[PDB]
Amino acid sequence: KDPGANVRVVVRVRAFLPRELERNAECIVEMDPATERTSLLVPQLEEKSFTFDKSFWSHNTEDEHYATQEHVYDSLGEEFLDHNFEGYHTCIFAYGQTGSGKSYTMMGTPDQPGLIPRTCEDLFQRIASAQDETPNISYNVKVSYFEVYNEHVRDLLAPVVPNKPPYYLKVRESPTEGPYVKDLTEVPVRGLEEIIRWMRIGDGSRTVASTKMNDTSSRSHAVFTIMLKQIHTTERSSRIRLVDLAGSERSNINKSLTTLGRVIAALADVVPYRDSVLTWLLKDSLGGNSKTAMIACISPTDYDETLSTLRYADQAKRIRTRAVVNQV
Amino acid sequence: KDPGANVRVVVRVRAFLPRELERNAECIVEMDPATERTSLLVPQLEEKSFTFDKSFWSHNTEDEHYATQEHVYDSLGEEFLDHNFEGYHTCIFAYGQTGSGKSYTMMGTPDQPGLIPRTCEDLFQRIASAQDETPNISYNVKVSYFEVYNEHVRDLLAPVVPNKPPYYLKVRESPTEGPYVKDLTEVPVRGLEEIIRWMRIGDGSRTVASTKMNDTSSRSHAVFTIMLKQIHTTERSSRIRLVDLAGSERSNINKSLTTLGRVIAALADVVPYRDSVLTWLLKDSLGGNSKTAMIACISPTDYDETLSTLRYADQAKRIRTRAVVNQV
C-alpha cells in the first residue's frame, strides 16, 4: 500500500580458520537448511534465533546445506543484476567483524571468485548475449572504485606516483543523483577481461594493514561501482554499488563505520547521513533510490562480535528504500 | 677445488584442490621426512625417485612432516637473505605447471604469506635491528617489479593510464652488471609497509588470464627484485631477485618458458641465453654471479606434468654459478 523496497538482509557464517582449527575451537552458529534461520548458541549467556532473507551456511564443506560462492551469487547476486538491467540502482554491502569473510564474500579468490567478479562475468555475458537477441539495444560499461579510510576518500584506479603524497578526492552533491566523489576516475570497460583488470588494479591500491604482514587495512571501506548504461537516440543508466566495509569489531579513523550503525538504527527503530563520509556517500543506497542488500558475515567462533553483527542485520531488515527505475 | 656455487634445487608438493578433492582424486607423490627424497608413484608407466636439497611436503596439514610457508622460508628464504646482506646477488625462482603452487609459494596469501613478503619482513627487521647494533652502517632499499609476457617487458610499478596503450620497456646491457630493463621504475622503500605496498600495486598490474574469471595470466613471468644497498663514505649493493614463472604445461607467446628449459639443459648435461627475453634477463641468475635457488612446484595428482617439473629440477642441481661478493 506504499512503494518501499525492504533492504534485503542475508547472513553467511564462514568455515573455521587454521588458527581456530588448531584449538579444537568451538562452533557456536547454527543454520537451519529449511527455515532461513540463524541461531547463536551458548558455548560449553544465552541462545538467540533470527530469521533472514537467506542464512548462508558456508561453514562446513561436507554439509548437505553448504553454501558455495556460486550458490551465494545464484541467490543474491544474480537477481540484483537483473534489477540493474531493468534499470534499477543496486547496492550490496558486506558487513561484519574483521576476518568474518566480507572480502571473501565480495571478492573471493582467483579460484574462489566472489560476488564481484561473478557479477562482472554475469553482466558481460548478458551484454554479449543481448547482441543478436536485441540488436537495436546496446550497452556501455564504466567502472569506478574508491576506498574511504580515516574519513579520506582515495581513487583506487588513479595512477600512483613514487615519493607519494597520497591524494584525496572531494565529496560533492548532484542535486538529482545524490552525493558522489568529485573527479573519481571512471574507466570505460569493453569486456570481462577489461573490467576484472581494473578491479585488480584498484584492489592492490588499497590501504595496507600494519597488523598483518600482507593485507588490506581492516579499517578501510571500499566501494566498487559499475555504472551500466543501456542505449536504445535514447538511453538510461543504472549503477551497481558493491561494498567491502571496514570490519565492525567493538576526520577520525572510526567515524564512518560507527555512524553507519547509527544510520541503520535510525532507519529501522533525523538520519545522520552526513555525520560521516561513508554514510554520506552511501546516503542514497541506504534509503534513497536503491535496491539494496546487506550481507552480514559472521565468524563461527566469536560470540559477542557475531551477536552484534546479527543485531544489526536484524535491525536492517526494517529499513525501506524508495527504489525506482531511471530514464533519459 | 674451483669456486662454483651449485644451483640449490627444492620441490614442494601442494594440497589437493577442492576440484580434485571432489573426485576422490588420487595422490601420486610421496616425500620421505628423513631423506630429502621425492617419489613419483604409479596411479592405480613407472615409479621414479629423486633427491633434492629439500623436498617440501605441503600436501597434508595433519602430517608429521608438513611444511608450512613459514617453514619453507625458514629453510630456503632466510639463508638466502643472509647471503644478500653479506653482499651476494641472490635469486629464487618458482617453476612448475599452472596451479602447482608457484604463486602460493612465492607470494602466498594475506594470511598465508609466501617467500616474498616473508623476505621483505625479515629484511626490514634486520635493518631495524642493525640500527643500534651497527650504527655506522645503514641501509637503503629500492624495489622494482616487472613481468614478461609474449616476449614483452612491462613495468608493473609504472603508473597505468586509461585508453591504455600498453607500454613496453627496452632491454640493454651493463657491460659490468649484466642485462637489465631500460628505465624500469625503482622505488625507494622506507619500510615493510612501503615495500609490501609496492608489491601489491605491481601485482594487481599483471596481465589478466582469460581462461579463469579472475586471475593472473598463466603465461606471464614476474620478476620481483629488491636492490639492497649497505652504506658504511663507502657502500655496496646486492640485489634480491624473486621470480614467479609462467606455468610449464604442454616475440612468441611461448619462447621464454620453453627456451628457459633449453638453458637449464645447456648448463647441466653455447647456452642460448639470448634466444628469449626472460632467459636473457636472467642470464646472470642462471650461471652468472648469483646465489640461486629453484623451487620446483608440483601437483600431487598430475603425473607427466610433475615428472617433467622433477626432471628439470633434477637437471638443475647440476648447474653451477659463479657467485661472488660485490663492492664499491
Ligand SMILES: Nc1ncnc2c1ncn2[C@@H]1O[C@H](COP(=O)(O)OP(=O)(O)O)[C@@H](O)[C@H]1O
Ligand atoms: N566462507 C568461507 N569459507 C571458508 N573460508 C573462508 C570463508 N570466508 C573467508 N574465508 C577465509 O577466512 C579468512 C578471512 O576472510 P576475509 O574475507 O578477509 O574476512 P574479512 O574480509 O572480514 O577480513 C580468509 O583467509 C578467507 O579466505
Ligand SMILES: Nc1ncnc2c1ncn2[C@@H]1O[C@H](COP(=O)(O)OP(=O)(O)O)[C@@H](O)[C@H]1O
Ligand atoms: N602449498 C599449498 N597448500 C594448500 N593450497 C595451495 C598450496 N599451494 C597452492 N595452493 C592453492 O592452489 C591454488 C593454485 O596455487 P597457485 O600458487 O596459483 O599455483 P600457480 O601459481 O602454479 O598457478 C591456489 O588457490 C592456491 O591458494
Ligand SMILES: [Mg+2]
Ligand atoms: Mg577484508
Ligand SMILES: [Mg+2]
Ligand atoms: Mg600463479
